[PDB]
Design a protein around this ligand. Structure first.
Ligand SMILES: [Mg+2]
Ligand SMILES: [Mg+2]
Ligand SMILES: [Mg+2]
Lengths: 59, 282, 49, 59, 40, 125, 46
RNA sequence: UGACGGAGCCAGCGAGUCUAACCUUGGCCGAGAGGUCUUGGUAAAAACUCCGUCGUAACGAGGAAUUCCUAGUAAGCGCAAGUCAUCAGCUUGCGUUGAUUACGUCCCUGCCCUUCACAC
């Protein structure tokens, strides 16, 4: 995933956080990718599409 | 062999499906037995079932370890092969040796270009009981899968906080007696299932004064595995870590060998269900 | 390790809490103690928040 | 539609083997011989396949 | 924010001591859960 | 119908199918003459049957070999095994059994792998 | 560390809520149901 | 036991209407939303065999110690997939080429076990 965070430092703060797609597919922030800054790896309960948008709910 | 193994699985699978159907019948016989002993009236369904009452005369004279392990439990000592993933790192080779020393009847085998169907077929020919395959990430063990032959189950674990004995200086050599086993805090049926799988990797009938103990301690589905050597003192017991340390968390359990990806799953870890955090299955 | 243990205890009457490095030309740290101190200091800080 | 792997399709029992006709590339003689009535018959043959299209959709 | 999974436990010194106390108790009571050879 | 026989040779993933029939001594591999088999250094390997029993026996038959899978070496071994098995089977079916016995004796005396598959199945220890 | 604390707090809060809601529902059924049945029999007696 | 170029040629895994860049220069249309075009920069089977050419600050194959390893094994080569844990600073599979040395001994080092015929 991209555009959620600006740098890998921010991702580490949210590692393990709960996320979902518009379709309702639930996932998790697994690890921050070294290159480029802000990109990160996530695992979802089912395969997602490129058109989907992932959301992290926070308060 | 191949024809014999195939039929034996079909008969085993057929026997299970009948047993699930027979479970209601078994309970009905229990009600009849209780009523005869206590004298209470039978329920209406049992009262009008003439066939069951006639059958009860023959079935009156009717009376544990899992079905796969029941045949050889406590009779034949296990035969275990410990292998790794293709092109293993040096650390994984060392760790595979440590796991080999952990189990008294384990043999380490090099997996260079061995194919998974070939590996299981080769082990089944030689009478091997279990197969252990280890994975790693940059020289850090990550997973451990145990496949019980000839027909499963296959239990896969993920290893965390691994501390190998090669990291210890002047550690010395291990003792290779048949060790005592400790299974702490396994309550649920799945916990009993895991205990049965892990228990049978060891030889039966350790000596009472055996000086080596292996403990599998369940703490929130993370089974801590430790190996200790103890000396009975005059006012208690003193133990010492021999290693390795690691915590293993079950995440899959299939009714078949590790080769068969189509084997029916006995249990899997659901991580994305909303109530995942709340309950501990083991 | 046990034979050393029996020799030690009879003389008197856990090397895994230490990692030891390899000398290329030795105990380097304390995981259980350091992580415990590392975990406790943020625990009281969490209590403060 | 589902496509069965050829490795699986090869080692299937006699009863269940999927019948997959290959396309023909060389022109068959009967394909070069058959006469198709044009003009009036074309208009009376397009009309029918329209009528059967409506009837199937209505049902 | 919410977290989907509980983090992997950290082996602190207190955790080891609690684990060690159980092992010493079991050995002292001489109660072990180990496979027993079947008769005949 | 023209008398013909079919045989298989196998080495690792390489599989060769040999069809041997009455003919005029035409040996082909994958639609080309046997003399063009590659690598050249191992060419005499695939010649080994033809030379061990003599080219006179092949003067009355045509052999067509089709090879798929594996690498160069395994393909060569599959070809030679298929050729030997095809010759023996043809002499079994459409010629006296005495010559069959002589062919089997020669091939087994030189190299038994020409007839029986060389399978290095794993053996745990 | 913060993730561990949040999960344990959430689980504790959820368990208490379910116990509390069960208690108020059970007590209402038992005490008011008794009067409901107790009244109904008098109407039957009448 | 090279580099460059050309030629010949050999695998097995793998198929969700699903697979996938970024930053700019400007034209036109449109109330807006936006749509289309234009533009520069940045990032992103191999082995094998045959033929022809040249030519033999840091570092030039890695000390002491220490670890592992017995046949389709060590080692080399590439191709796929990412399968609720783990993994992409990577992980797991798949095929290709494929050896040397031992397969004996309890001498040393550890661990372990012992103290129904006939014949002994
Ligand atoms: Mg290797
Ligand atoms: Mg590789
Ligand atoms: Mg690897």
């Amino acid at each position: 995933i991209k555009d959620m965070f600006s740098s890998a430092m921010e991702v580490a703060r949210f590692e393990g956080a709960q996320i979902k797609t518009v379709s309702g597919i639930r996932g998790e922030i697994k690890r921050a990718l070294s290159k480029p800054e802000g990109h990160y790896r996530a695992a979802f309960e089912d395969k997602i599409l490129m058109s989907d948008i992932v959301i992290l709910r926070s308060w | 062999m191949l024809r014999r193994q195939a039929r034996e699985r079909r008969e085993y699978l057929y026997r299970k499906a009948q047993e699930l159907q027979d479970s209601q019948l078994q309970q009905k016989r229990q009600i009849i037995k209780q009523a005869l002993a206590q004298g209470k009236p039978l329920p209406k369904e049992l009262a009008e079932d003439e066939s069951l009452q006639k059958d009860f005369r023959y079935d009156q004279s009717l009376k544990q370890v899992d079905d796969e392990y029941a045949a050889t439990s406590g009779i034949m000592d296990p035969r275990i092969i410990v292998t790794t993933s293709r092109d293993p790192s040096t650390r994984l080779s060392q760790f595979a040796k440590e796991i080999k020393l952990l189990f008294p009847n384990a043999v380490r085998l090099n997996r260079g270009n061995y194919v998974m169907p070939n590996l299981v077929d080769a082990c089944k020919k030689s009478g091997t009981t279990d197969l252990v395959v280890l994975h790693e990430h940059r020289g850090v063990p990550t997973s451990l899968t145990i496949s019980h032959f000839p027909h499963g189950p296959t239990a896969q674990f993920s290893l965390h906080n691994v501390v190998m004995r090669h990291d210890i200086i002047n550690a010395g050599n291990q003792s290779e007696v048949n060790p005592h086993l400790i299974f702490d805090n396994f309550t649920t049926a799945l916990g009993k299932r895991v205990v049965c799988i892990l228990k049978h990797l060891f030889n039966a009938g350790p000596k009472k004064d055996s000086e080596r103990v292996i403990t599998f301690a369940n703490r929130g589905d993370f089974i801590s595995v430790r190996q200790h050597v103890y000396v009975r003192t005059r006012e208690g017991v003193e133990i010492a870590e021999v290693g390795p340390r690691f915590e293993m968390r079950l995440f899959e359990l299939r009714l078949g060998t590790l080769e068969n990806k189509d084997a029916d799953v006995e249990w899997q870890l659901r991580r994305f269900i909303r109530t995942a955090n709340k309950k501990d299955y083991l | 390790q046990l034979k050393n243990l029996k020799a030690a205890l009879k003389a008197r009457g856990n090397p895994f809490e230490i990692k030891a490095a390899r000398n290329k030309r030795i105990a380097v740290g304390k995981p259980g103690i350091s992580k415990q101190i590392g975990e406790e200091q943020r625990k009281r800080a969490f209590e403060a928040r | 539609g589902l496509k069965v792997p050829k490795a699986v399709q090869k080692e299937l029992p006699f009863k269940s083997q999927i019948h997959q006709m290959k396309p023909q590339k060389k022109k068959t003689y009967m394909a070069k011989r058959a006469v198709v009535l044009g003009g009036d018959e074309k208009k009376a043959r397009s009309f029918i396949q329209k009528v059967l299209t409506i009837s199937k959709a209505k049902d | 924010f919410d977290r989907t999974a509980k983090p992997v436990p950290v082996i602190t010194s207190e955790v080891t001591e609690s684990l060690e106390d159980m092992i010493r108790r079991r050995i002292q009571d001489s109660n072990f859960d180990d496979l027993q050879r079947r008769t005949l | 119908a023209v008398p013909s026989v079919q045989t298989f040779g196998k080495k690792k993933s390489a599989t060769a199918v040999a069809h041997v029939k009455a003919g005029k001594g035409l040996i082909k591999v994958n639609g080309s003459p046997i003399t063009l088999v590659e690598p050249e250094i191992l060419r005499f390997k695939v010649y080994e049957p033809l030379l061990l029993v003599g080219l006179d026996k092949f003067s009355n038959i045509d052999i067509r070999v089709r090879v798929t899978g594996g690498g160069h070496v395994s393909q060569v071994y599959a070809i030679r095994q298929a050729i030997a098995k095809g010759l023996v089977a043809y002499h079994q079916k459409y010629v006296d059994e005495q010559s069959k016995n002589e062919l089997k004796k020669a091939f087994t005396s030189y190299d038994r792998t020409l007839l029986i598959a060389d399978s290095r199945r794993p053996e745990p220890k | 560390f913060e993730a561990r604390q949040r999960i344990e707090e959430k689980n504790k809060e959820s368990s208490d809520y379910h116990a509390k809601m069960a208690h108020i529902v059970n007590t209402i059924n038992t005490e008011e149901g008794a009067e409901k049945n107790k009244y109904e029999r008098e109407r039957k007696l009448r």
